[PDB]
Amino acid sequence: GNPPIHPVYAAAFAAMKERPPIHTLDLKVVRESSEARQLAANIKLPEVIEEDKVVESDGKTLKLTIVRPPGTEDQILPVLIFLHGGGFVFGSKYTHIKPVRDLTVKANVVTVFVDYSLSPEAKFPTAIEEIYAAILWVRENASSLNINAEALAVAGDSAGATLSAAVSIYAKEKGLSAAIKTQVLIYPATAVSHAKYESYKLFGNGDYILSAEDLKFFSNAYLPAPASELNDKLATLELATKADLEGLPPALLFTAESDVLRDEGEKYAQQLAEAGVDVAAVRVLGAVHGFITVPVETPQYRFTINTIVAHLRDIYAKYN
Amino acid sequence: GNPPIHPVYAAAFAAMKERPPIHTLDLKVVRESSEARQLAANIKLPEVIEEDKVVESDGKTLKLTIVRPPGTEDQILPVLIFLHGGGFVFGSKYTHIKPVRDLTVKANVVTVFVDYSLSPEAKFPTAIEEIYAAILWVRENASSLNINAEALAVAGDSAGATLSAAVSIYAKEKGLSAAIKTQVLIYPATAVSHAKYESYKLFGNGDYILSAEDLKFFSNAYLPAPASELNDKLATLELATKADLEGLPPALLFTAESDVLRDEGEKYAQQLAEAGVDVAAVRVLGAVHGFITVPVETPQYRFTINTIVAHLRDIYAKYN
């Protein structure tokens, strides 16, 4: 309830302690709401070739961003489906620009960024259905995207990690069980009830970046009913049966040491292994929730990027 | 005291637990202790070029094994100093043949395996002094070994991890503080008293691979006096001051979830970060003490090898 955190994370929270709770803000705090604050960061970014597209698939209209390294336009690449965090309420290609551009050039892939519908304007399960539809589209247009559509991965942070895990189950229930070759899950949310876990108590009182109070706001925005009445594993992953999880694609899971969602994340890792799924799971020491989008580099930001890149290249090599 | 472990590790424990105990064996249990029982595993290994040498350095005589990938003999490579585990009492190039050959070929390096003096025939601090002398020898003969001696790292498991960390401090106190560019530490032992940490209680009662009874055997074998009377940081890393740890090289530390040494390993990570050292540290879920030398591959063995390879190549690149 009290180990040390890296000074960069401590400095970032202290600046945040001044602000009002979230339910008392105009949701066009999306604009400042670090599109602006992240541009002000001034951080180093690697050169990239970026392109936006608007398409139709499986009965939906989608917006996508396609990101590729320089000098690879004529080369056929593996593909990464990236799902951003933000509590289901915020986030865009501007807020997550640093980890997306880093993964793309270091792994040497084509990244498809899915700009899914945000809550509370949309609710469960619209985004899961959009992400399934985008996956179908990428398989249909591999030749025009210059990718090997069989070498495919899904990866995301926070709420994006929750979506990566659910669309892996959804795709299987639709008869598409061989499409996704790996799932990368960076501090996901999984629980019907969070107060069951010790980390909720230790880090949820408002002195760390993601509070028990913040969590209650995001759940109400995302869910169309209370989780206990909803009783749906695609909404709350913790409910998944051994049968639900059997045959899922190999997983890589990260958890943060000082994070209310820590223990429920580690419990889902255990659930996947019981069902026979290949799982590599680690707890990262000194880190807090959301650290992959923190602009000032730390030893754990660098470790996590490099470690994901090596896992992706290990998986992709089996399909070339 | 009760999370799940991988089925492979449970199987390995029952096979080891059925065998006669340690303090009731002739120390020429060395021939059978996974020189034969390893060979006998007959697992696939990758091709390598191996060479043994006997040399003089800093007033000592050393035995070394030098390992390199095929087709790189004329290319100048970075170098990895490797220190095997075994409680300070067992271990050789036959017991650790699998991770040494994997690291060598995947990272594309020259591995120098240091066959240090075993306990109880030798005691603290003889082995530490031998490893410093080998580091000096590697630096003297870089042109004859075909390596860039500046791009140098030290890595080890269990007791080999304890040795990696101590020789990083020893070398610094000798005025050789720029020689080691990174330390890789796989479940090390650090404590004066182990019973201060909760993981000693949870996993030390004889139902896991490294018991409190086993630990007591190795300490009495290695130490010339009790740790509390010795009061020496190079013997028990936990005693190290902030002043001792300043200016040390960047660390990668692995800890195992079901392992008596878990909490004291995680404490040493905190100590290094407090002193300003760059540290990436993780807890590996589902794993037990000693897992890097288990022959049957697990998702955790693969993750750990690939992740070390990605860290070594990150460090080496800034020196070429």
Numbering used by the authors:
A (entry chain A), B (entry chain B): 4 to 323
Question: How do the authors describe this structure?
Answer:
We recently characterized two novel HSL family esterases from the thermophilic fungus Rhizomucor miehei: RmEstA and RmEstB. The physiological substrates of RmEstA and RmEstB detected in our studies have been found to be short-chain triacylglycerol, linalyl acetate, and butyl butyrate. Both of these enzymes belong to the α/β hydrolases and exhibit distinct substrate specificities: RmEstA shows highest activity toward longer-chain esters, whereas RmEstB favors hydrolysis of shorter-chain esters. The three-dimensional structures of two HSL esterases from R. miehei, RmEstA and RmEstB, were determined. Both of the esterases were composed of a core catalytic domain and a cap domain, exhibiting the typical α/β-hydrolase fold. A classical catalytic triad consisting of Ser161 (Ser164 in RmEstB) as the nucleophile, His292 (His291 in RmEstB) as the proton acceptor/donor, and Asp262 (Asp261 in RmEstB) as the residue stabilizing the His was identified in RmEstA (RmEstB).
The crystal structures of RmEstA and RmEstB were determined at 2.41 Å and 2.27 Å resolutions, respectively. The triclinic space group of RmEstA was P1 with two monomers in the asymmetric unit. Amino acid residues 1–3 of RmEstA and the uncleaved C-terminal His-tag were not visible on the electron-density map. In the asymmetric unit, RmEstA formed a dimer in complex with three sulfates, and two of the sulfates interacted with two monomers via Arg104. Note that the third single sulfate was found in the crevice of two monomers, with four Arg residues from two monomers forming an arched area. The side chains of His292 and Asp262 in RmEstA were stabilized by a network of hydrogen bonds located at the carboxyl edge of β-strands 7 and 8, respectively. The substrate-binding pocket of RmEstA was a channel running through the whole protein and the entrance to this channel was surrounded by five α-helices (α1, α2, α6, α8, and α9), the 310-helix G2 (His197–Lys199) and the loop regions (His87–Gly90 and Ile291–Ala298). On the other hand, the substrate-binding pocket of RmEstA is a curved tunnel which can accommodate ester substrates with long acyl chains. RmEstA can hydrolyze esters of longer carbon chain lengths (up to C16), with the highest activity observed for C6 (15), whereas RmEstB favors the hydrolysis of esters with shorter carbon chain lengths, with highest activity observed for C2 (16). A structural comparison of RmEstA and RmEstB suggested that the differences in the substrate-binding pocket might make a marked contribution to their distinct substrate specificities.
